[PDB]
Design a protein around this nucleic acid. Structure first.
Ligand SMILES: [Mg+2]
Ligand SMILES: [Mg+2]
Ligand SMILES: [Mg+2]
Ligand SMILES: [Mg+2]
Ligand SMILES: [Mg+2]
Ligand SMILES: [Mg+2]
Ligand SMILES: [Mg+2]
Ligand SMILES: [Mg+2]
Ligand SMILES: [Mg+2]
Ligand SMILES: [Mg+2]
Ligand SMILES: [Mg+2]
Ligand SMILES: [Mg+2]
Ligand SMILES: [Mg+2]
Ligand SMILES: [Mg+2]
Ligand SMILES: [Mg+2]
Ligand SMILES: [Mg+2]
Ligand SMILES: [Mg+2]
Ligand SMILES: [Mg+2]
Ligand SMILES: [Mg+2]
Ligand SMILES: [Mg+2]
Ligand SMILES: [Mg+2]
Ligand SMILES: [Mg+2]
Ligand SMILES: [Mg+2]
Ligand SMILES: [Mg+2]
Ligand SMILES: [Mg+2]
Ligand SMILES: [Mg+2]
Ligand SMILES: [Mg+2]
Ligand SMILES: [Mg+2]
Ligand SMILES: [Mg+2]
Ligand SMILES: [Mg+2]
Ligand SMILES: [Mg+2]
Ligand SMILES: [Mg+2]
Ligand SMILES: [Mg+2]
Ligand SMILES: [Mg+2]
Ligand SMILES: [Mg+2]
Ligand SMILES: [Mg+2]
Ligand SMILES: [Mg+2]
Ligand SMILES: [Mg+2]
Ligand SMILES: [Mg+2]
Ligand SMILES: [Mg+2]
Ligand SMILES: [Mg+2]
Ligand SMILES: [Mg+2]
Ligand SMILES: [Mg+2]
Ligand SMILES: [Mg+2]
Ligand SMILES: [Mg+2]
Ligand SMILES: [Mg+2]
Ligand SMILES: [Mg+2]
Ligand SMILES: [Mg+2]
Ligand SMILES: [Mg+2]
Ligand SMILES: [Mg+2]
Ligand SMILES: [Mg+2]
Ligand SMILES: [Mg+2]
Ligand SMILES: [Mg+2]
Ligand SMILES: [Mg+2]
Ligand SMILES: [Mg+2]
Ligand SMILES: [Mg+2]
Ligand SMILES: [Mg+2]
Lengths: 151, 129, 144
RNA sequence: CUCUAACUAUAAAAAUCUCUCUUCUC
RNA sequence: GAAUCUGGUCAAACUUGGUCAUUUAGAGGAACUAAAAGUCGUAACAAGGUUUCCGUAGGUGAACCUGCGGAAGGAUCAUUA
RNA sequence: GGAUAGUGGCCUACCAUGGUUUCAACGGGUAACGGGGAAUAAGGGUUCGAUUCCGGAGAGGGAGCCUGAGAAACGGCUACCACAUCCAAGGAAGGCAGCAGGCGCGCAAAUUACCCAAUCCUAAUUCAGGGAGGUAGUGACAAUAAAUAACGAUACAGGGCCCAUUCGGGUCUUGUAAUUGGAAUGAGUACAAUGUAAAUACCUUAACGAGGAACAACUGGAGGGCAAGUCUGGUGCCAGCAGCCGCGGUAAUUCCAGCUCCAGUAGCGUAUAUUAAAGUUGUUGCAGUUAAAAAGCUCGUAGUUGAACUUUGGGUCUGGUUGUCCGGUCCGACUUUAUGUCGCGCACUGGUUUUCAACCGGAUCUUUCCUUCUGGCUAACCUGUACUCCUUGUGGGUGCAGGCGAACCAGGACUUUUACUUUGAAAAAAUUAGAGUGUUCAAAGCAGGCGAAAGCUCGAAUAUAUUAGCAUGGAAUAAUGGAAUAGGACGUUUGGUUCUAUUUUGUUGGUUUCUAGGACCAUCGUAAUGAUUAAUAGGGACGGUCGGGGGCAUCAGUAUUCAAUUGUCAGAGGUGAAAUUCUUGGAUUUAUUGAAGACUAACUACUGCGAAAGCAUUUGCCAAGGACGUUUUCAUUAAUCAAGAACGAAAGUUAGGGGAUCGAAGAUGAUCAGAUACCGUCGUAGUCUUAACCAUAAACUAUGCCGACUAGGGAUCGGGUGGUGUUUUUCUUAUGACCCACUCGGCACCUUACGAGAAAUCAAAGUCUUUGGGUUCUGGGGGGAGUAUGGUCGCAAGGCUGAAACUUAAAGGAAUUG
């Protein structure tokens, strides 16, 4: 209930079931689930969409329960992990969108403040992904780099 | 954010004792809380507690019997030399005949009398009486 | 829980916070700035000699109606001029004009005492002899 | 043990004041 | 092997300005205290007799007045009458 | 390279452009020499430390140097500057912050004394010398013990009284009286002697030395704080007292005196400084709603802090320490003695497996490792070789090849690193603590004690310093690191490589061997082959939403003020009341309309959104956001934040645009004693905007943010679940709208104290003397004053930062009665 960059106090979340092992009713194969994950990734989908597709259209409760590895971990084992992590990429996309809206109309100050907030969040997440060495130590965020990474 | 979990546990115990209850539900349930309540059980200030596995930090259900009157953490776990134990007991415990400054030595989490018996001392965790 | 930090590695900010707050006191600020040496009529001095310039009395405050018999003295150690008070019934006549007089503190930490306005100094000795010995006729002024 | 109704609506001007305050124990 | 003497070297110190710091006067100016039996008003404390106060701007013997936004520390915690 | 005794930018030559810093560098101040220590004292601390010891520096300020082992010496020289001295005017000689003493300074500090007796030191060395030093002189700096009377016998009295005929003996004692006696003794003098280098002085002691024992004790106070007077006289808000409150105005418990009394007492009073009081510096341990004090809000580097998780159990043996039950040992009641006896329920020393119970360890078994080998050394018997000393008995051995290494060495080998904590070596003496010790006691000192008096002796103990360093045992708490591209760990693997070199073939030079020794490189297998949860912490994806969040562009509404046309006709505005003003050129109203600019009524609420300002007509576009749902994804990415930044009401400032209303200035008409104020009519700047500034508000919930818990009652907004629910109508159903129940989040609200506050009151202002969840900012009585100055921002207005001198005993908060 922290809401890092606002005054919100919500706790809307999801409760992972107690049992780590596979559900009794699931009949699919772990290798088939991994193949499905690989195909979804090759279609050009981020891990969160892969998980949502496996939960909705199929009986996959969660990949770690069925296979034993996580979705991003499974993709990395097969070398399909994107060079920028998904959350940071989405933050980049949001930031470039707000910057476009700003440069198309100057007088909107609220979106300017929101862009400041988004840039602060981008800096924090970049620092985290840099100390873990997911990103190179020279990775940084300025104007026209966000567009290049997004496009 | 939750910085000192044992502080939350002891505060919950204090609040549920002052109101006259006989049970507490401590959520985060670390090692240190388990050892602290185990010492309190050994000295009788607590009843029959319980660890509830969640696969996520677990929880604890504590049974009381009204014998306790105050827990409390010394939140900065000060390095307590063996000479400074008596000063802490004087400043915290209400009388020399009872009370226990629960402190964590290299030989485990122990009451101050037991630590003085082992002739070993470390950091201070809290106080019970 | 409290305004001050409590961590085991927060000695620096606690110490500097105490050091910055200490200036709120008046004794500490006076002691560190050294205001007594620079601005006070005496620099850290309990007593000081001086020369009588003139012989004036000052009226008291509202609830107290009288004229306290003081004396204006120019200090010899540095040249400052201060009013001082001769404490007793018949001691004004004892001190004469243009004689060395040893002034002391007035007992109220360099502030005006009682109903006497704009004075901060007693008179203990005149022309080498003390006022109290003159007032009880134990010694007499040398009249030099 | 059963219910939601009645209603208003005046403003003229008017400054100032000197002393002196005094114990509560079977 | 003395005086003397060539070049350095350590360099005190002198002259000349420059600079800063502390004392140091100084025509005059703007103040603040204390003293409360001066004078002109009576702003505030009650609805202080124009409710009060804050920010900002203008004005005027003086407190103060006015304009625009606030706040109740308001004189209302209240119109499903 | 030079110089140095020697390392060293210590200096030179040539290169490189580096070194420190928000963990405060650099600069400034220090009425700063550092330390051992001193004062103060519940604990934590605050202040001081020029000076008896250790270091450093200096000899008026500066530089330079000879001699030596050692000096940048100064009671050694050279020169300059400052200050000076004798002078025969040519010259010469100076260094007290050494002991004395003087001038000056200032509140502030000693005699031109004796002497090498004692401590030592220098020298050729006992002997000489030493103002080092000791002795005396002055010395109320501080510190120790302590005189100023003690006891009778008498008169004036009081209490326990034999009872109570009034009594009253005083039966039993305790004081008060200029009555009255006998004693003792010093403070002083002083034969002596001791003392001392010689003398004082002290210890001893002749002879004197107490009656008012004049051999005479003061310093402050007597309203309160604060022990002791409402006694006498004097002065009358004078004189004066009074640290503060206060007394003094003709009866002063406070001023000046006399009497009495109180406190300390050879000391007491004042002044400044400082400590405890001060929980008024608050780490322990302060407060911020209104008393002083939460930055207007948000982001954010440094700093501080940061979820849980990685062997917990057991069984045995065994070592100390306890309390156990008693053994031996024995002692208290029995008194000149004891045992038999009365047991303190054993005053010394054991069985301490008597179960007991711990309180600490040590070794052992876990798939349970504690660094392991490589040679020693094999210490030790799983060795079995020759065998058995002795009862046929594994009690017990003489002993040699394997072979036990933690019983220990001394060597290669790898060492995750810390923070923490136990122990020890260390932290000079003096000081503090503290043991022993009759200096006559004590401050002290390190002395002393015991013989028969015939030399015999125990001492000169200990602890602490909390930081830094060194060693050591421990492994909870806190942090870091392994294996994710396997470049991971092991092995008799099996291959190759630079080598290295003991010996060996004499030695020396290479060539290869061999043996043994690190890796660089492949390949071969052994293995459970290697990735903790996904926080009722966070970020992100998705879903339907929700909102007067924000921007741009459009749309409407009546209203206002003008204008056009039209209508009639004396008034219309406005006010407490009037007047200024407009009106038969027909105003005020009357109908249509038109123009402009602003605004968004009623719906509008203890309702919503937003970080705060703030946001209210319709529609479209633009992006953003909270909340909920989620068996989605990453796995600590987080909380608060110095530096830095973004927004920031109104007002105000530059320009360009507009220009309706309302209205700072101004113009007046009233009211008044005045009214250039409030009431009224006009009325510029402004209000409304596009750019650029401004950064302040009672920017208020006067309540910082994040996190946990604690108590009952309803409603309300957004979301989501369920109802065998109700109307809806599209025949039924799906929605929607309600009804009931629950849940999450938000603005809120009622009751209550069982909690907190000085209360008003707060469901947080609670979980705070039973004081510690993390963290930022601010306040230390009022005024001066948010002033001056110095920075910095601004065109300006002004914003941020921001004292002191001085003055004052209160200012202030809440509530109670008038
Ligand atoms: Mg007068
Ligand atoms: Mg020369
Ligand atoms: Mg008048
Ligand atoms: Mg008034
Ligand atoms: Mg009026
Ligand atoms: Mg008026
Ligand atoms: Mg008024
Ligand atoms: Mg100095
Ligand atoms: Mg010193
Ligand atoms: Mg010092
Ligand atoms: Mg000095
Ligand atoms: Mg010295
Ligand atoms: Mg020297
Ligand atoms: Mg000198
Ligand atoms: Mg020599
Ligand atoms: Mg010299
Ligand atoms: Mg000399
Ligand atoms: Mg010398
Ligand atoms: Mg010489
Ligand atoms: Mg001298
Ligand atoms: Mg001397
Ligand atoms: Mg003196
Ligand atoms: Mg003397
Ligand atoms: Mg006497
Ligand atoms: Mg007296
Ligand atoms: Mg007196
Ligand atoms: Mg008197
Ligand atoms: Mg009294
Ligand atoms: Mg009298
Ligand atoms: Mg306070
Ligand atoms: Mg106020
Ligand atoms: Mg205030
Ligand atoms: Mg605030
Ligand atoms: Mg940081
Ligand atoms: Mg932790
Ligand atoms: Mg010592
Ligand atoms: Mg002592
Ligand atoms: Mg080889
Ligand atoms: Mg989570
Ligand atoms: Mg809905
Ligand atoms: Mg108009
Ligand atoms: Mg008309
Ligand atoms: Mg509307
Ligand atoms: Mg709404
Ligand atoms: Mg800041
Ligand atoms: Mg404006
Ligand atoms: Mg304009
Ligand atoms: Mg006007
Ligand atoms: Mg007028
Ligand atoms: Mg007006
Ligand atoms: Mg108008
Ligand atoms: Mg402000
Ligand atoms: Mg404020
Ligand atoms: Mg103040
Ligand atoms: Mg102020
Ligand atoms: Mg300025
Ligand atoms: Mg009040």
């Amino acid at each position: 209930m922290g809401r890092m960059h606002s005054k919100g106090k919500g706790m809307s979340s999801s409760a992972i079931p107690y049992s780590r092992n596979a559900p009794a009713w699931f009949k699919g194969s772990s290798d088939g689930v991994v193949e499905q994950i690989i195909k979804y990734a090759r279609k050009g989908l981020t891990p969160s969409q892969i998980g949502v597709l496996l939960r909705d259209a199929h009986g996959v409760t969660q990949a770690k329960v069925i296979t034993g590895n996580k979705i991003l971990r499974i993709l990395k084992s097969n070398g399909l992990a994107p060079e920028i992590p998904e959350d940071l990429y989405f933050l980049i996309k949001k930031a470039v969108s707000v910057r476009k809206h700003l440069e198309r109309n100057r007088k909107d100050k609220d979106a300017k403040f929101r862009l400041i907030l988004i840039e602060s969040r981008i800096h924090r997440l970049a620092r985290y992904y840099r100390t873990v060495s997911v990103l190179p130590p020279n990775w940084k965020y300025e104007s026209a780099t966000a567009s290049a990474l997004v496009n | 954010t939750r910085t000192s979990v044992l502080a939350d546990a002891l505060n919950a115990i204090n609040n549920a004792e002052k109101t006259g209850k006989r049970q507490v539900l401590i959520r985060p349930s670390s090692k240190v809380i388990i050892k602290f309540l185990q010492v309190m059980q050994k000295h009788g200030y607590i009843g029959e507690f319980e660890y509830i596995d969640d696969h996520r930090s677990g929880k604890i259900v504590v049974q009381l019997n009204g014998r306790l009157n105050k827990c409390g953490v010394i939140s900065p776990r000060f390095n307590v030399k063996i000479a400074d134990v008596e000063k802490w007991t004087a400043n915290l415990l209400p009388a020399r005949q009872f009370g226990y400054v629960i402190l964590t030595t290299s030989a485990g989490i122990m009451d101050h009398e037991e630590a003085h018996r082992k002739h070993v001392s470390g950091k201070i965790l809290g106080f019970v009486y | 829980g409290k305004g001050k930090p409590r961590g085991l590695n927060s000695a620096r900010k606690l110490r500097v916070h105490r050091r910055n707050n200490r200036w709120a006191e008046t004794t500490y600020k006076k002691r560190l700035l050294g205001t007594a040496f620079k601005s006070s009529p005496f620099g850290g001095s309990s007593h000081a000699k001086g020369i009588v310039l003139e012989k004036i009395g000052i009226e008291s405050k509202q609830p107290n109606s009288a004229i306290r018999k003081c004396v204006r003295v120019q200090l010899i150690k540095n040249g400052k001029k201060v009013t001082a008070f001769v404490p007793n019934d018949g001691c004004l006549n004892f001190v004469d004009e243009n004689d060395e007089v040893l002034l002391a503190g007035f007992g109220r930490k360099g502030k005006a005492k009682g109903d006497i306005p704009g004075v901060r100094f007693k008179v203990v000795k005149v022309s080498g002899v003390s006022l109290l010995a003159l007032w009880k006729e134990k010694k007499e002024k040398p009249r030099s």
